[PDB]
Ligand binder design. Structure first.
Ligand SMILES: OC[C@H]1O[C@H](O[C@H]2[C@H](O)[C@@H](O)[C@@H](O[C@H]3[C@H](O)[C@@H](O)[C@@H](O[C@H]4[C@H](O)[C@@H](O)[C@@H](O[C@H]5[C@H](O)[C@@H](O)[C@@H](O[C@H]6[C@H](O)[C@@H](O)[C@@H](O)O[C@@H]6CO)O[C@@H]5CO)O[C@@H]4CO)O[C@@H]3CO)O[C@@H]2CO)[C@H](O)[C@@H](O)[C@@H]1O
Length: 476
């Protein structure tokens, strides 16, 4: 009797490319590409387990633009330049970026503490600030290859900085290839999401928010987003086809968000399986275990992730010693294994790139121990999404209805319902009446609503500039 374990790592960035200037206004796609988007699948080169990935189409677009040398990234330009060429504004940006990241374990360099305690930085000190910001985001592969430069920790030259930059772009250029490789070799399945990671249930029917939060105020949805919901799904199928040669049969619904209408739309667009959150299961069915394969109306297969296990990795284990965390995780799997006489399917689904910067050494000791341990446990069999979808020796159940929600408390309050987030929906509704191009789809991404009305910390103003620029461009 085995326990079936299914990792599904979700990779996404909203579009940071300002539509009028073409400038990438935040470097987050670059930094998570060099740190996580290649290295997370690259673990499969070293560990004989299965790991699955979701790539949003808008993230794929940006990875391609960087790989082709076409991404004009303003923060990266402040890193690349000789410090003598830095604008006062770029020095300010560098210092502000360092301050935002200063307390993260991946920024634990003594030299960074020295630099941030200095009243003024000369050219050598700025070169160190630039290069250490680069190296703080070094991924697992290059932490080995560049170990000597990493251990310097100080006294970097322009040539060394440029060497690191060149190796980083090599990683970006190999990124889509590694996803093709692990897919073709059967080491993992690759899914995608509707194109710009929107909240499909809201686009189809904004009143679905009242299934969980009856008291929420929402704006007057005087325009229909139902066709746009379809377009996000259809365009994602086309992008994922361009990159892999086939249409996707698995999708990750953004924010785990489902509703009866959304599940119908995914079924109508030929999606065979998705996953969502355990809270949605608990809200939809009186008594239901998350270790079964569910069939929604016999139309589409649904797995509900183990929320506890997913949250342990995504939010808890950064605060643990790596050995203890793996012991805890394996011990929890052992209890699931012993708690049923059938073979449970355990979905661990979370963002694949955001938690590691808070782990010691970028989560590498944790993941190397986890994967090394899992590959040796005879009673655990990790599965691709395809294997999980088709496994015969599992328990299944038909469900007829779900209560609309997301993996944030089973509801939509992170994206709608307060004055500021509702203002964004009002802006989008009015812009949709006059829309002329697909930039209206960009503006439908969940990220813009996530940051709005929170507020409040460096760069939220950048997300607001992007959202409003996309809204403006959509009407031309
Ligand atoms: O000043 C605030 C903040 O600033 C910086 O953060 C910046 C960040 O470092 C940078 O990379 C970027 O963030 C990106 C991010 O990298 C992308 O992946 C993307 O994030 C979205 C993600 O793809 C989505 O799946 C979604 O994930 C969220 C959920 O929406 C949340 O509800 C929550 O979900 C969990 C939930 O809490 C739990 O109950 C659990 O059951 O499971 C859920 C999932 O595990 O968290 C996840 C992850 O955040 O939404 C994401 C946001 O839309 O796009 C991001 C940008 O839109 O930009 C950040 C701001 O500049 C700084 O580094 C931070 O340290 C600081 O905290």
């Amino acid at each position: 009797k085995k326990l079936f374990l299914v990792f599904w790592w979700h990779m996404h960035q909203p579009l940071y490319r300002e539509p009028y200037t073409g400038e990438y206004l935040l470097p987050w796609t670059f930094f998570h590409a060099v740190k996580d988007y290649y290295d997370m699948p690259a673990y499969l080169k070293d560990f004989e387990i299965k790991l699955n990935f979701n790539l949003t189409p808008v993230l794929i677009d940006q990875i391609q633009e960087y790989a082709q040398g076409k991404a004009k990234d303003v923060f990266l330009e402040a890193i690349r330049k000789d410090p003598d060429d830095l604008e006062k504004e770029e020095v300010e940006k560098l210092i502000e970026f360092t301050k935002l990241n200063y307390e993260k374990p991946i920024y634990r360099f003594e030299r960074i503490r020295e630099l941030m305690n200095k009243e003024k930085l000369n050219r050598e000190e700025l070169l160190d600030l630039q290069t250490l910001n680069l190296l703080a985001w070094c991924g697992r592969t290059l932490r080995k290859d560049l170990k000597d430069l990493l251990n310097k920790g100080r006294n970097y030259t322009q040539e060394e900085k440029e060497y690191v930059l060149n190796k980083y772009f090599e990683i970006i250029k190999k990124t889509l290839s590694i996803y093709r490789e692990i897919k073709e070799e059967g080491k993992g399945s690759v899914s995608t999401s509707p194109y710009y990671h929107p909240l499909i249930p809201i686009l189809l029917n904004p009143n679905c928010v009242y299934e969980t939060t009856p008291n929420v105020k929402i704006p007057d949805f005087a325009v229909s987003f139902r066709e746009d919901a379809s377009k996000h799904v259809e365009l994602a199928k086309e992008k994922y086809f361009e990159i892999f040669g086939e249409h996707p049969v698995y999708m990750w619904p953004p924010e785990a968000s489902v509703s009866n209408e959304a599940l119908e739309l995914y079924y109508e667009k030929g999606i065979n399986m998705l996953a969502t959150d355990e809270v949605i299961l608990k809200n939809s069915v009186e008594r239901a275990s998350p270790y079964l394969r569910y069939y929604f109306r016999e139309l589409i297969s649904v797995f509900f992730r183990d929320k506890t296990l997913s949250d342990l990795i995504g939010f808890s284990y950064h605060a643990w010693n790596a050995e203890d965390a793996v012991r805890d995780f394996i011990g929890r799997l052992k209890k699931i294994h012993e708690s049923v006489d059938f073979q449970p399917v355990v979905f661990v689904v979370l963002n694949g790139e955001n938690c590691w910067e808070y782990y010691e050494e970028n989560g590498i000791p944790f993941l190397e121990k986890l994967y090394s341990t899992l590959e040796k446990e005879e009673w655990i069999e990790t599965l691709t999404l395809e294997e999980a979808m088709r496994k015969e020796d599992v328990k299944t159940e038909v469900i007829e209805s779900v209560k609309a929600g997301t993996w944030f408390d089973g509801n939509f309050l992170k994206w709608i319902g307060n004055k500021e987030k509702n203002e964004y929906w009002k802006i989008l509704i009015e812009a949709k009446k006059k829309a002329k191009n697909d930039y209206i789809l960009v503006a439908e991404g969940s990220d813009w609503f996530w940051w709005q009305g929170e507020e409040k910390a460096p760069f939220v103003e950048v997300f607001d500039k992007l959202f409003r620029s996309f809204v403006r461009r959509a009407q031309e």
